């Protein structure tokens, strides 16, 4: 999944298999350093790309004057009543009109979707 950069040359490590030991080794083409791979996964592609946008949402968006705010939905973490609510705001979000609520009030930074 993640890309690992070699210490010796600070370049990308590409997967390589040692036939003798049948052990996956991440080896740079430029330098001879080789590292055994713990993950054992080379390439992962999510065609559905069903990735939650809760992680992507920034807590700073609560400060926006233009965003609508509801006191109807209380915060789960701290119980603050106000909560700005906005849609996906994302391209390639397929067809979702879910409201990604963000708790207001300083430093709570809680994002929940109902």
């Amino acid at each position: 999944v993640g890309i690992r950069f070699c210490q010796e040359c600070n370049n990308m490590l590409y997967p390589k298999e040692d036939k003798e030991n049948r052990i996956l080794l991440y080896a740079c083409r430029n330098c001879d350093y080789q590292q055994e791979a713990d993950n054992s996964c080379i390439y992962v592609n999510k065609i559905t790309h069903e990735v939650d946008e809760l992680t992507q949402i920034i807590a700073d968006v609560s400060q926006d004057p233009t965003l609508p705010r509801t006191e109807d939905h209380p915060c789960q973490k701290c119980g603050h009543k106000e909560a700005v609510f906005f849609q996906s705001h994302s391209a390639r979000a397929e067809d979702a009109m879910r409201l990604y609520y963000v708790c207001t009030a300083p430093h709570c930074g809680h994002r929940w979707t109902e």
């Binding site: 926006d64 233009t66 965003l67 609508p68 906005f86 849609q87 705001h89 397929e94 067809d95 979702a96 009109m97 879910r98 409201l99 109902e114």
Partner: protein, 144 residues
């Protein structure tokens, strides 16, 4: 020639008296708009809860726009029909529409009851600003 010389005796005119309708008709138009706005709000709340089910061959955004446009169009036509009921025999807008000389039922409806939905490029007014049509409206407002 003959009809134009009779028109000197009878005469024709267009005034504000033609545009104005009875108070009951205005109340009916307003009530239709009220319940239409409520229906659009209910559709929006269904969409936010994700209870809305996609129409076959259409995305959820497309089917939400379809349903909202249907509700707004039905309200628009119903208010127009109420306005057209209000018209008296003497009303001159009706004289011209019935005779076919100029105008249409749509023009009477827009004059008296409701101008209607404004559509650009086949859709409702788009989000020119970031996620809102005009700076005065709140972000992510799909209301009427």
């Amino acid at each position: 020639t003959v009809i134009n010389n009779w028109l000197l005796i009878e005469g024709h005119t267009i005034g504000i008296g033609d545009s104005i309708a009875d108070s009951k008709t205005y109340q009916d138009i307003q009530n239709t708009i009220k319940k239409a706005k409520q229906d659009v709000i209910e559709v929006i709340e269904k969409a936010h809860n994700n209870e809305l089910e996609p129409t076959p061959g259409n995305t959820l955004r497309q089917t939400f726009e379809n349903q909202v446009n249907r509700i707004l169009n039905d309200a628009r036509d119903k208010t127009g029909s109420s306005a057209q009921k209000s018209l008296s025999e003497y009303n001159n807008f009706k004289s011209m529409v019935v005779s076919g000389a100029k105008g249409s039922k749509i023009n009477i409806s827009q004059v008296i009851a409701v101008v209607g939905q404004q559509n650009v490029e086949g859709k409702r007014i788009p989000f020119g600003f970031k996620h809102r049509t005009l700076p005065h409206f709140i972000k992510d407002d799909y209301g009427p």
